[PDB]
């Protein structure tokens, strides 16, 4: 019947959901728990560079709070 | 660096597939297999003879319309202007001119094809 279309469509769906989930998780993991910052504009790039220079480890995601 | 990396990986993947395709299968090459194809009977002429185009006018009109799309594309940034009256008036003028040109070419049987 029509139920036999669903198998290949299931393989489809898994292979099409894998990309987004994978990229999101990789971004979080490689940017330390926060989704990748976006530099649409030179101001945001400047802020990210300031964060990198302030981290002391040369990584923009490492954050410093009032304790600093 | 990342866009370069991804596009280079794509290029390498495609090239690797091409190389596999061209160097894996067993090859038996002879003239009949390598000659062009035309539905069973040998060609009667070359494929490089002139091939008249019946839509040349709309080809050039496509060039012009592509450039007018070019003029239109800055609109998303333009709309942030403080001179909205002028922006809107100029965009309306441009689109109206496009429409009138299309209307003229339509009424002069331009979008039709030569026979």
């Amino acid at each position: 019947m029509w139920f036999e279309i669903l198998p290949g469509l299931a393989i489809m769906g898994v292979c099409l959901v894998i990309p987004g989930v994978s990229t999101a998780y990789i971004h979080k993991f490689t940017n330390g728990g926060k989704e990748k910052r976006v530099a649409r504009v030179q101001y945001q790039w400047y802020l990210m560079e300031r964060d990198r220079r302030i981290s002391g480890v040369n990584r923009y995601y490492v954050s410093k709070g009032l304790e600093n | 660096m990342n866009l370069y990396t991804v596009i280079f990986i794509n290029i390498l993947l495609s090239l690797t597939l091409i190389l596999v395709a061209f160097w894996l299968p067993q090859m038996n090459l002879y003239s009949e297999k390598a000659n062009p194809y035309e539905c069973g009977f040998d060609p009667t002429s070359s494929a490089r003879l002139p091939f008249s185009m019946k839509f040349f006018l709309v080809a050039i009109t496509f060039l012009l319309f592509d450039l007018e799309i070019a003029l239109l594309l800055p609109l998303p940034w333009a709309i942030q202007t403080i001179k909205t009256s002028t922006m809107m008036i100029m965009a309306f003028i441009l689109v109206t001119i496009l429409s009138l040109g299309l209307a003229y070419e339509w009424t002069q049987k331009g979008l039709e094809w030569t026979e």
Binding site: - | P25, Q26, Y30, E32, K33, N35, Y37, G40, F41, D42
Partner: protein, 156 residues
């Protein structure tokens, strides 16, 4: 176990691919083409067996000679066979094609397509039933299933 074992399994995979996906070229010369169409029809459904028609001989595997092979036609059939890429197989369906058929003693008809091309499977009939042609296709799949090309190379 042995390089022979791995080569045998590789050959098995090779033939599994080739037999599971074989694309007949859209060739049809007379009545027997109608029974080929019916074989394509829903009731038997060639596609179910992985068989799908393709027009360009450049993208085909099996040439199903369906119908009489007239002298005038013979050169065209020979060239399309030659232009098919290897590996390629020829299936002859109908008396018209296996031999001269009803028109065997005529001045125009080539008495059998096997004279113009090397045939693999001969399907008899007039017209062979769509079921008969399906059985012939399965026979060709069996023929491919026993190939031993890689094994013959390794032993070579």
């Amino acid at each position: 176990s042995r390089a022979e074992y791995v080569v045998t399994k590789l050959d098995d995979l090779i033939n599994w691919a080739r037999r599971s996906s074989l694309w007949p070229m859209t060739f049809g010369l007379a009545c027997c083409a109608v029974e080929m169409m019916h074989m394509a029809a829903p009731r038997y459904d060639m596609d179910r067996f992985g068989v799908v028609f393709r027009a360009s001989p450049r993208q085909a595997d099996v040439m199903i000679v369906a119908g009489t092979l007239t002298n005038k036609m013979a050169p065209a059939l020979r060239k399309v066979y030659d232009q098919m890429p290897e590996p390629r197989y020829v299936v002859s369906m109908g008396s018209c094609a296996n031999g001269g058929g009803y028109y065997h003693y005529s001045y125009s008809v080539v008495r059998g397509c096997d004279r113009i091309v090397p045939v693999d499977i001969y399907v008899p009939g007039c017209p062979p039933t769509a079921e008969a042609l399906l059985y012939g296709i399965l026979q060709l799949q069996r023929k491919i299933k026993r190939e031993q090309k890689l094994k013959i190379w390794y032993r070579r």
